[PDB]
Design a protein around this nucleic acid. Structure first.
Lengths: 331, 242, 131, 120, 179
RNA sequence: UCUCGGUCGGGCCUCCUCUUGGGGCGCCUAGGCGGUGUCUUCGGGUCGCGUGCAGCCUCCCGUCCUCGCCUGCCGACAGCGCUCUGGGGAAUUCAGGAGGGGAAAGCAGAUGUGCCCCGCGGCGAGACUGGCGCACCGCCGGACGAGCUG
């Protein structure tokens, strides 16, 4: 127990901002005393022996909310002199001792990241992201958020770097692999929108290493096909779709997912006179898959889910709608 | 002899855990059995119906030098109930079973067997008693289970190896809390056949102080074994615990 | 999920944590006789076995339990008591063994040796003086 | 309680509004946490139950109710406050009616004199 | 104050909160408890008397040994104190010097000497008796529990007239005269 | 107001101002009592054997006769111990001591963010170069360097 003294440090450093706010007409004295009191009690709560990330988040919300109130009120008072720097800095220091005391909270980490990102400190943000990744190397969500921030900024090489280290690590779930394929194909789409990547062999390659991944499942390849089937308005999209189809046909031939992708395969970038023709083609695929020797319950569940999405989209013909309804009822 | 089914009583012994069963013409040494009603090696065990589940196990001193030392009356063996107990020399786990019964369901024993078939016996007794984990590898290379043994408080050691002092030195350096307690068994014929055993004992002691211990008790467990000395010392400090 | 508590708010200790709860000894007079026997286990062996004379004045341990040997699977041809010798009590066992004659013999020796010159002797003298 | 210490500074009211449920574990727990000298002067008679944490039974309540006027006045004034406030409910009213009825029975049992003036 | 630590002890060598060097090993208090007095003022009055006594002894010895007046007052002081019982002999000035003591005074007070004559079991309970007033001297009753019983009066200090105590004694020893 | 000397006081320091012809509480016993077990003496009975004589024989119960055992009381004298605002006991109040766990318990130098530039420093693709090299197989050193970064 030295908790009073440690608080004495932090509150005493808090002092001169409050001195200035006293000296301005922004707050009155009783309010000031209220503020100091609340701050002292919170700081003692933080430096208590048994503390918890919820308490941390409570405190930082208090301070950040104070910053916003101060901003609104000095705006109403039309005063431009006050800054937010000291509040943001002390806010940071809260986050720093928070991660020293409890490093093991994804929740507190993401709160930290979001705080930095909303106030505009990207170098610091990358550093914080670094430490958090180092402490929790199995977390697909952090891996994704880092890499997606890097891709949105545009630094594609570091995006790939985070993602490759993450796929090197998190080999239990396919989740990072789907996310990396997602953002990689998004980068290809960024290149096409700007108009090697002329080939764009990289999702084929990650599919190839997926083939020897530990989670390597038929349902895994199915969700792979799903996220590939997203945003089919590309160039080599038909190439990669043919590739994933023939690979899973070669590997899991009579799997009901293989029959599902055999149905939904020619529907890459379609919305429209090309719509019902490919609809009838995939419907022939569907009738063939239904009559084929597959697990008809599994395949029919796949098909009624895909039909649930199909009926979720609008703008179709009623005869087609009802024959889908009948083919669903017959399952 | 102390034939089966006799009515004897049990009283506490001054070390915690161990009790003494006295009765009729026989007084003998015993410990609360964790896994009730199941022998280890065809050892004798003592039932008692309390106003059912509770049963004890006798030790043979002739079998375990740990037992023999206690009967000789060492001062303190440092292994109170709750204490993490490293063993060295898990010779099929008989005394290891006994020491597990000492340290109870809250304690821990980490054991070292190097031979394989003895290890089969050992892991069998580990499969029965949950508080002992076995370790089958070479005790000379505590790198082999540095991932597997956390910080323990008492090192029992009873290997018959000539490098015994440097063995216990390295295993202590990797596995012992400041304020370490250890017991070690000395077979003078194994260390140095030619020499007088008391001097053999002394040389062992001086190697141990060279490896930074402090001896505090020592006796010949004489009327249970010839030419063996139990040595009790502390790692790195003087008083025992902390 | 979050329910009302129960209130239950209303000396030397009872069972021993540091020895896996040997209970405090209930003191049946049979147990007291047993302990008397055990403190005298020296004279039980009529010279055939001497023990370390562990004698406090207070022959009672504040913690104890009455037990029985189970089974030595190594030795089951003699190292086990027969049914007609599986007695309920220690003193019953030492009763059922032999040398009770020898006990009686030594006791009557000491009976003589202390009846030696005490009172019947003197009465015999005063009688053969009065006659 | 843990904020305003109702059990300490509005003791008689809380004891009043818990007395109807006087058989229940809630009542015994409250009985535990009550401060002794804080208990109002009529309700002081629950102290041996505080010494022995078991709920009192209704006969004990009614006997103290028969001996004193103040406890009975207090219960009646409480429940009157409630029904003035239109917050009564059949359990409480049944409680109050039962206790008032048995108390008045016992009270006339006391007041009988034989002697004309004391009866009057 | 806690038991002070090592270095703080080596600074507070001469510091102690209880045994003052003026408090004189609490000799005052140790005696006063042991002998059941009620007035530490009465302790110090005893004391400065004993002091005047010892300086008389010291100056008496200072007188050359061969003098008449020395011889006369050796005998006088000795036989007088002996008849006050506070001594044990009557022939040794060294005994007057390092023997005459306020403790011996207290053991010639009244309750202590009634324990010695075996009036009652413990000198506390003796104080309780003589405060209630069962204890006579000569022919008077006595309340003042410092009535210094000189040696000629130890033989007389006995029980009072109408005492439940005296009747209790006669009850136990079976002569209980109701007249 | 710079020293110095002397002085029946004090401060300071010392050893007395306690170790009692005393009391309480225990140990220890000569032994009294209660519980209670023998041995002697006979008498009654009892399991059975015998010849069902005579006897023999197990067991019990009572008398006589003494002796002994019990963490059981009490226990005279004398001897010893402890301890004396007497000795117990319970609540309750304050003042310390000793030990067991539980507790990330973690303020070595506590500087808003973002930019660029400069200075310095690191990685770092690539490009050279000196001499050495009697196991001959390669060393080790200078000084350029895109790009990145502190």
């Amino acid at each position: 127990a030295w908790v009073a003294d440690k608080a004495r440090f932090y509150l005493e450093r808090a002092a001169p901002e409050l001195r200035e706010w006293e000296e301005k007409e922004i707050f009155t004295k009783d309010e000031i005393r209220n503020l100091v009191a609340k701050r002292s009690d919170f700081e003692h709560l933080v430096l208590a022996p048994g503390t918890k990330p919820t308490d941390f988040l409570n405190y930082v919300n208090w301070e950040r909310s104070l910053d916003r109130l101060r901003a609104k009120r000095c705006a109403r008072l039309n005063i431009r002199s006050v800054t937010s720097h000291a509040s943001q800095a002390r806010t940071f220091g809260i986050f720093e001792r928070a991660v020293l005391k409890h490093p093991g909270s994804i929740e507190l980490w993401l709160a930290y990241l979001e705080f930095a990102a909303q106030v505009k400190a990207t170098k610091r943000w990358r550093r914080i992201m670094t430490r958090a990744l180092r402490l929790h190397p199995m977390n697909a969500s952090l891996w994704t958020l880092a890499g997606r921030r890097a891709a949105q900024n545009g630094d594609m090489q570091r995006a790939r770097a985070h993602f490759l280290r993450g796929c090197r690590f998190c080999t239990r779930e396919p989740t990072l692999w789907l996310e990396y394929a997602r953002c990689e194909m998004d980068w290809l789409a960024r290149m096409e929108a700007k108009k090697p990547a002329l080939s764009g062999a990289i999702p084929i390659a990650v599919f190839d290493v997926a083939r020897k991944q530990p989670f390597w499942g038929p349902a895994a390849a199915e969700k792979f096909f799903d996220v590939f089937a997203k945003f089919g308005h590309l160039s080599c999209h038909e190439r990669i779709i043919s590739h994933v189809v023939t690979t899973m046909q070669e590997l899991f031939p009579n799997h009901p997912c293989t029959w599902s992708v055999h149905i939904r395969q020619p529907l890459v970038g379609v919305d429209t006179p090309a719509f019902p023709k490919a609809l009838r083609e995939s419907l022939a695929r569907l009738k063939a898959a239904l009559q084929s020797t597959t697990d008809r319950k599994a395949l029919a569940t796949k098909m009624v889910a895909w039909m649930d999405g199909i009926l979720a989209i609008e703008k179709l013909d009623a005869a087609i709608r009802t024959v889908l309804e009948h083919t669903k009822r017959s399952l | 002899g102390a034939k089966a089914g006799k009515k004897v009583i049990v009283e506490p012994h001054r070390h915690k855990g161990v009790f003494v069963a006295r009765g009729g013409k026989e007084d003998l040494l015993c410990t609360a059995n964790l896994v009730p009603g199941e022998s280890v090696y065809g050892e004798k065990r003592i039932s008692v119906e309390t106003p059912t589940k509770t049963e004890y196990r006798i030790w043979n001193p002739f079998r375990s030098k740990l037992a023999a030392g206690i009967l000789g009356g060492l001062e303190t063996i440092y292994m109170k109930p709750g204490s993490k107990v490293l063993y060295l020399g898990a010779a099929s786990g008989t005394s290891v079973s006994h020491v597990a019964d000492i340290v109870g369901p809250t304690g821990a024993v980490y054991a070292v067997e190097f031979s394989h078939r003895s290890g089969r016996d050992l892991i069998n007794m580990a499969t029965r008693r949950t508080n002992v984990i076995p370790i089958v590898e070479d005790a000379r290379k505590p790198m082999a289970y540095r991932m597997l043994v956390p910080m323990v408080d008492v090192i029992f050691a009873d290997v018959a190896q000539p490098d015994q002092a440097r063995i216990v030195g390295i295993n202590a350096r990797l596995f012992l809390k400041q304020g370490g307690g250890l017991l070690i068994s000395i077979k003078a014929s194994c260390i140095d056949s030619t020499a007088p055993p008391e001097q053999v004992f002394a040389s062992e002691v001086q190697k141990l102080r060279e490896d930074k211990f402090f001896p505090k008790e020592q006796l010949t467990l004489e009327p249970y074994e010839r030419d063996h000395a139990m040595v009790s010392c502390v790692y790195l400090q003087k008083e025992f615990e902390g | 999920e979050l329910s009302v508590r129960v209130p239950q708010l209303p000396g030397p200790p009872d069972t021993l944590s540091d020895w896996y709860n040997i209970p405090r000894t209930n003191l049946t007079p049979e147990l007291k006789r047993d302990l008397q026997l055990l403190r005298m286990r020296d004279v039980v062996a009529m010279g055939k076995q001497f023990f370390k004379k562990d004698n406090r004045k207070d022959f009672v341990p504040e913690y104890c339990q009455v037990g029985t040997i189970i089974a030595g699977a190594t030795d089951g041809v003699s190292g086990r008591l027969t049914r007609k010798e599986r007695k309920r009590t220690i003193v019953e066992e030492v009763l059922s063994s032999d040398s009770v004659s020898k006990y009686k013999r030594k006791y009557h020796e000491i009976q003589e040796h202390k009846k030696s010159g005490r009172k019947g002797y003197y009465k015999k003298l005063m009688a053969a003086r009065k006659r | 309680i843990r904020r305003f210490r109702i059990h300490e500074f509005n003791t008689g009211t809380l004891l009043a509004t818990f007395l109807p449920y006087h058989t229940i574990p809630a009542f015994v727990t409250l009985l535990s946490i009550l401060p002794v000298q804080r208990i109002p002067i009529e309700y002081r008679f629950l102290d041996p139950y505080i010494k022995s944490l078991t709920p009192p039974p209704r006969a004990a309540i009614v006997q103290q109710a028969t001996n004193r006027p103040d406890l009975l006045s207090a219960i009646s004034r409480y429940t009157l406050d409630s029904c003035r406030a239109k917050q009564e409910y059949p359990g409480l009213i049944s409680f109050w009616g039962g206790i008032m009825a048995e108390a008045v029975n016992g009270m006339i049992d006391k007041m009988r004199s034989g002697r004309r003036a004391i009866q009057l | 104050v806690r038991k002070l630590k090592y270095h703080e002890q080596k600074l507070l060598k001469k510091h102690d909160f209880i045994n003052y060097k003026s408090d004189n090993n609490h000799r005052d208090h140790d005696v006063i408890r042991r002998y059941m007095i009620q007035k530490p003022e009465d302790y110090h009055k005893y004391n400065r008397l004993c002091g005047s006594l010892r300086q008389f002894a010291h100056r008496l010895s200072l007188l050359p040994p061969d003098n008449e007046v020395r011889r006369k007052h050796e005998t006088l002081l000795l036989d007088k104190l002996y008849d006050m019982g506070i001594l044990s002999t009557k022939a040794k000035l060294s005994a007057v010097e390092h023997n005459v003591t306020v403790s011996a005074f207290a053991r010639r007070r009244l309750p202590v000497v009634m324990t010695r004559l075996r009036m009652a079991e413990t000198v506390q309970a003796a104080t309780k008796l003589i405060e209630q007033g069962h204890v006579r001297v000569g022919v008077e009753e006595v309340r003042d529990p410092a009535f210094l019983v000189t040696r000629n009066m130890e033989d007389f200090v006995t029980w009072t007239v109408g005492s439940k105590i005296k009747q209790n004694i006669m009850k136990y020893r079976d002569k209980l005269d109701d007249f």
